[PDB]
Amino acid sequence: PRSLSGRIVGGVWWFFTLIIISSYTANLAAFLTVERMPIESAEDLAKQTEIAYGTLDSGSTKEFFRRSKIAVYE
Amino acid sequence: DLAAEIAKHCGFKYKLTIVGDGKYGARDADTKIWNGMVGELVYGKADIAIAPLTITLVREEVIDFSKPFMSLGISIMIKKKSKPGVFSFLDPLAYEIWMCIVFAYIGVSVVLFLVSPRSLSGRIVGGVWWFFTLIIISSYTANLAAFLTVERMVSPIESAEDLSKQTEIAYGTLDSGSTKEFFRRSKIAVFDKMWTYMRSAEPSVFVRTTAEGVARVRKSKGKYAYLLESTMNEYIEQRKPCDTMKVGGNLDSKGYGIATPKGSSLGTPVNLAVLKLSEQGVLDKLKNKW
Amino acid sequence: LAYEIAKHVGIKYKLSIVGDGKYGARDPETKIWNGMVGELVYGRADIAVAPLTITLVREEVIDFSKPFMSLGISIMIKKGVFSFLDPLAYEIWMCIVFAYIGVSVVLFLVSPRSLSGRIVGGVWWFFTLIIISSYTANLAAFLTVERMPIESAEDLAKQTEIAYGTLDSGSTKEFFRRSKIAVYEKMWSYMKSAEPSVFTKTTADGVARVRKSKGKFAFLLESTMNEYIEQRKPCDTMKVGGNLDSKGYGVATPKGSALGTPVNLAVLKLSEQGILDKLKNKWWYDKGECKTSALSLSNVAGVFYILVGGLGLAMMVALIEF
Amino acid sequence: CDTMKVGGNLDSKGYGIATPKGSSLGTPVNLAVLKLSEQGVLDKLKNKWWYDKGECTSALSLSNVAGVFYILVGGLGLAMLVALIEF
Amino acid sequence: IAPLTITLVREEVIDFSKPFMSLGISIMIKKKSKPGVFSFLDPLAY
Amino acid sequence: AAFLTVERMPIESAEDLSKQTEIAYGTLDSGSTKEFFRRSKIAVFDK
Amino acid sequence: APLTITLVREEVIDFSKPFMSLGISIMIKPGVFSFLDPLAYEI
Amino acid sequence: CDTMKVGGNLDSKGYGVATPKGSALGTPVNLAVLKLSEQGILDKLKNK
């Protein structure tokens, strides 16, 4: 019933979730309006393995990667 | 570092000397004399130039250049990923509104307090108060969305094309040099649009030095973008105060090369050394290091 | 400024207000100069210290100091519970009320898991869910796009809902007529053809037009005057954008004056010492009287009054019951 | 009334009354145009022939919301049917 | 006395008064109501 | 909310015209309007 | 022709300065991760 | 029309005109290339 202690807890928690679900809704709407766009950089490629990537089996492109001392290309 | 590497690979001892006039190398149209590092090679005051000297036709006609040890092109430098402030939560719903919603809050808990199932009196109070809060939370949600929708709309320069399209953000290039010329001579629509704007912009968007163009970006409060070499742009981006950013792809392609007087006995070996260092991956190591 | 110049040049002086109250132009008929320029060219005054613009036509007949104040053409702009009844149409508020009593009457015929009236409460809930969702979504639209709000000459040039113009003669109109800059040429093309006329006879007319035309007029004028009016009551206008061009006010002396050199050097000294900046700040600001990212209380307020009204109605229904 | 004018004018031109070169009518006719313009007569004339003799808002619609009203009354009717059978 | 535009080529051979009417190139398009309960079934896919 | 925002975001200007090809557009076959476009150095008009 | 300036070739023929610059580049052609984005994983 | 380039270039190299060792064309060809580049002709040609 009216247990003031845990009562304000339920109220504050409700106000808390209210703000969050409102934020989620608002933000999702922005997303559905602009909707700007899954690989955009060598950095992106390097950090993952689901999208495989490669080169000609011989020639300068393969050699570039083999020789590079730059962290991302290594 | 590059000098130590080529000296080692070519087998020679050397002395590093800073160019007396602090210039790169251009030929005065009137006196017909060469200045800078090119002048020092042409006139016999130095036997090799190891520096960020671009391989150009006019220079190649008077000195020898190895193959490029580093690539570059015209790029864009703009004044710029952190922005908390709990005050972005108090904005959507105005402080004045948070107040009244609290006054009416106790304004209802006091009306109900005077009442004590279907008690029609306080019944419509709960209903009207519900309809009241419904509108408010709906307003908060809707309003919060516009601030996030526009936050995404902001795509505020990301390319030459972006630049070419407006005039809120002024933009220029070194007052004399290859970047200014590139735009002056270009037959590409975007670049020609950027040139007719630049040449007539007032106050002048052209800078006397590269350092001025960087300082202008940093001190113009987001109203100036500078067109400079990609190598320089990406280097400043890694320097404190960390307030600049390189945007868009390179507009052209040039290269730095090590130069020697024509017919120099050092030319063959020095060129071979650059190919080797590149292939060993050393030039890339050096760029990442610095 | 007169006191400072006199001190630095070392002379005694008498301030005399020009009789005709004019700056100085050649009469069309007689070609005789009026105003302060007239007082100088016809031997009545030794020097003019006033907001007198450095212009070719004047520099041909008198000498100007370097500018003591810079200025340019600038844009002046002016800074309903019915915005709550718009999102959800009056017709919709009605039907939602008709269906409202349309459900309270259906339930009234019914009298836990009473399947009959049970699905009624569920369907009615799904109904109100859609409506409140529509209201929320729609309300987000106006506050997102918000098409009519002017921050630049570029903005003005791209639209026609907010009209804009200048004095019907004089240098501001001429700037636009002569400009080869794309944005100002576009502005000139619009202004010269606009109907009703966007040109005014006086600054007062232009400023009044900004104030009383429901945000549908912007006025183009000198930055100094724009800035001054921005700092006077009723504090309802403001300057937007930077200056569109550059010109200067100068001190004027008659040709052959022995004061010419000393006056010029005095002006440059006062400028470089920061005195002129301070003086402008004094008279404009010290003596003054005064995208989108904000949410207002206005609309929300209308919902507060209907709440208190409901509370009062209940406080009335309560009393009668007892 | 099926056409519409959109966008601002792309350029600026003007119509003028013409006379042979050196005509004795030229001076007077030009002065007359300035006068008629200043008296506001040319604007009266354009409004008369374009608008007086002419032969031709913001927010949400009810259409979409209406579809949700019919599904409501349909639910009420379904309940009024389930009620009768129960009794 | 007609809707005759003041142009250079014509001005070189005849006299023109100041303009009695302004004009410019504009766009004419063939022309605001759209119900369809199918704008409600779109947001949330069938 | 997005369906109404975009709904506010089918020709309203020369720029609109210049950007597409669903709606064809032309001018008198001879005359000053045709020439204006032929001679123009403005990007929208040249397009 | 589009003949790349290389060490092995520069040893036996002479190349002009480049007439075209180029470099190594990346060619590419639902995701429930568009639901985890709005509200951050941290949130 | 189903592929695209992403990111900038990862390195830099060039295509050049090649002449046999000892060719009397070497110098003129090199200067011609630099002239066409600086005049904006090669950019225009690539765009074409």
JSON list of N, CA and C in Angstrom, two decimals, chain C residues 137-138 140-141, chain F residues 1-2 4-5:
[
{"chain": "C", "resi": 137, "resn": "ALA", "atom": "N", "xyz": [4.29, 12.05, -32.94]},
{"chain": "C", "resi": 137, "resn": "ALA", "atom": "CA", "xyz": [5.06, 12.06, -34.18]},
{"chain": "C", "resi": 137, "resn": "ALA", "atom": "C", "xyz": [4.86, 13.36, -34.95]},
{"chain": "C", "resi": 138, "resn": "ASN", "atom": "N", "xyz": [3.60, 13.76, -35.12]},
{"chain": "C", "resi": 138, "resn": "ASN", "atom": "CA", "xyz": [3.28, 14.98, -35.85]},
{"chain": "C", "resi": 138, "resn": "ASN", "atom": "C", "xyz": [3.85, 16.22, -35.18]},
{"chain": "C", "resi": 140, "resn": "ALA", "atom": "N", "xyz": [6.47, 16.38, -33.52]},
{"chain": "C", "resi": 140, "resn": "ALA", "atom": "CA", "xyz": [7.91, 16.36, -33.73]},
{"chain": "C", "resi": 140, "resn": "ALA", "atom": "C", "xyz": [8.27, 17.04, -35.06]},
{"chain": "C", "resi": 141, "resn": "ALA", "atom": "N", "xyz": [7.33, 17.04, -36.01]},
{"chain": "C", "resi": 141, "resn": "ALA", "atom": "CA", "xyz": [7.61, 17.52, -37.37]},
{"chain": "C", "resi": 141, "resn": "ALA", "atom": "C", "xyz": [7.81, 19.04, -37.44]},
{"chain": "F", "resi": 1, "resn": "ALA", "atom": "N", "xyz": [6.95, 9.68, -37.13]},
{"chain": "F", "resi": 1, "resn": "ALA", "atom": "CA", "xyz": [7.44, 11.05, -37.03]},
{"chain": "F", "resi": 1, "resn": "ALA", "atom": "C", "xyz": [8.29, 11.38, -38.26]},
{"chain": "F", "resi": 2, "resn": "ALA", "atom": "N", "xyz": [8.96, 10.35, -38.76]},
{"chain": "F", "resi": 2, "resn": "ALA", "atom": "CA", "xyz": [9.85, 10.46, -39.90]},
{"chain": "F", "resi": 2, "resn": "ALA", "atom": "C", "xyz": [9.07, 10.61, -41.20]},
{"chain": "F", "resi": 4, "resn": "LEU", "atom": "N", "xyz": [6.38, 12.19, -41.55]},
{"chain": "F", "resi": 4, "resn": "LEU", "atom": "CA", "xyz": [5.85, 13.55, -41.60]},
{"chain": "F", "resi": 4, "resn": "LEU", "atom": "C", "xyz": [6.98, 14.56, -41.75]},
{"chain": "F", "resi": 5, "resn": "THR", "atom": "N", "xyz": [8.15, 14.23, -41.20]},
{"chain": "F", "resi": 5, "resn": "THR", "atom": "CA", "xyz": [9.32, 15.09, -41.33]},
{"chain": "F", "resi": 5, "resn": "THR", "atom": "C", "xyz": [9.80, 15.11, -42.77]}
]
